[PDB]
Design a protein around this ligand. Sequence first.
Ligand SMILES: NC(=O)c1ccc[n+]([C@@H]2O[C@H](COP(=O)([O-])OP(=O)(O)OC[C@H]3O[C@@H](n4cnc5c(N)ncnc54)[C@H](OP(=O)(O)O)[C@@H]3O)[C@@H](O)[C@H]2O)c1
Ligand SMILES: Nc1nc(=O)c2nc(CNc3ccc(C(=O)N[C@@H](CCC(=O)O)C(=O)O)cc3)cnc2[nH]1
Ligand SMILES: [Mn+2]
Length: 159
Amino acid sequence: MISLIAALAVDRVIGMENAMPWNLPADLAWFKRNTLNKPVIMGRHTWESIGRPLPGRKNIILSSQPGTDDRVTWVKSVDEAIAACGDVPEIMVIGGGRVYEQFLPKAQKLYLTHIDAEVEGDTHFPDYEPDDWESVFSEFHDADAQNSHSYCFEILERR
Ligand SMILES: NC(=O)c1ccc[n+]([C@@H]2O[C@H](COP(=O)([O-])OP(=O)(O)OC[C@H]3O[C@@H](n4cnc5c(N)ncnc54)[C@H](OP(=O)(O)O)[C@@H]3O)[C@@H](O)[C@H]2O)c1
Ligand SMILES: Nc1nc(=O)c2nc(CNc3ccc(C(=O)N[C@@H](CCC(=O)O)C(=O)O)cc3)cnc2[nH]1
Ligand SMILES: [Mn+2]
């Protein structure tokens, strides 16, 4: 099955100038816990933003161009990216905006972190249809000394 995982600020903002402006270690820990030992599919811009492989995960990068790093797997279409994952229980799509839009219709599950941050961005999570999704997990956390915004971890399943 295909899942998307993302962290969204106000208005579904997910990035600005090829970075995630906020810094929430608790959310990065959630991301790691939910992606470790699964393939991750990302677009080339997200690959560049992260800047290095994510350890302990098969990293698959979408690009129309030939790859530039054999520590990761390079593919040229959505269907090729899925194939390159092989027979696994769960594929994690890790963005960015353009990649999320293409995988959303194929996805069965969304792992969304809703961050209480105002951020002026240039990239958004898709404007998905709320009626298509059932919330099956929701956990809110207040800000603390390590995490400067409140945030809520949610898992949605396609109805
Ligand atoms: N908050 C979050 O959860 C989160 C998660 C991920 C990323 N981000 C942020 O999102 C931003 C990046 O998102 P983005 O929308 O600009 O870019 P993106 O989706 O990461 O990358 C788009 C690139 O992927 C390739 N690509 C995408 N679909 C393809 C297809 N079907 N076939 C072949 N290649 C394909 C293309 O590379 P070529 O140009 O080489 O063809 C394209 O330019 C950054 O700000 C990043 O920090 C945030
Ligand atoms: N919930 C969520 N939060 C994110 O920040 C996020 N980021 C991306 C893409 N960008 C990134 C950027 C850095 C790392 C990262 O350094 N992760 C380390 C965690 C270090 C830790 O455990 O604190 C990793 O091993 O996953 C992951 C994804 C995609 N989906 C997301 N989803
Ligand atoms: Mn159902």
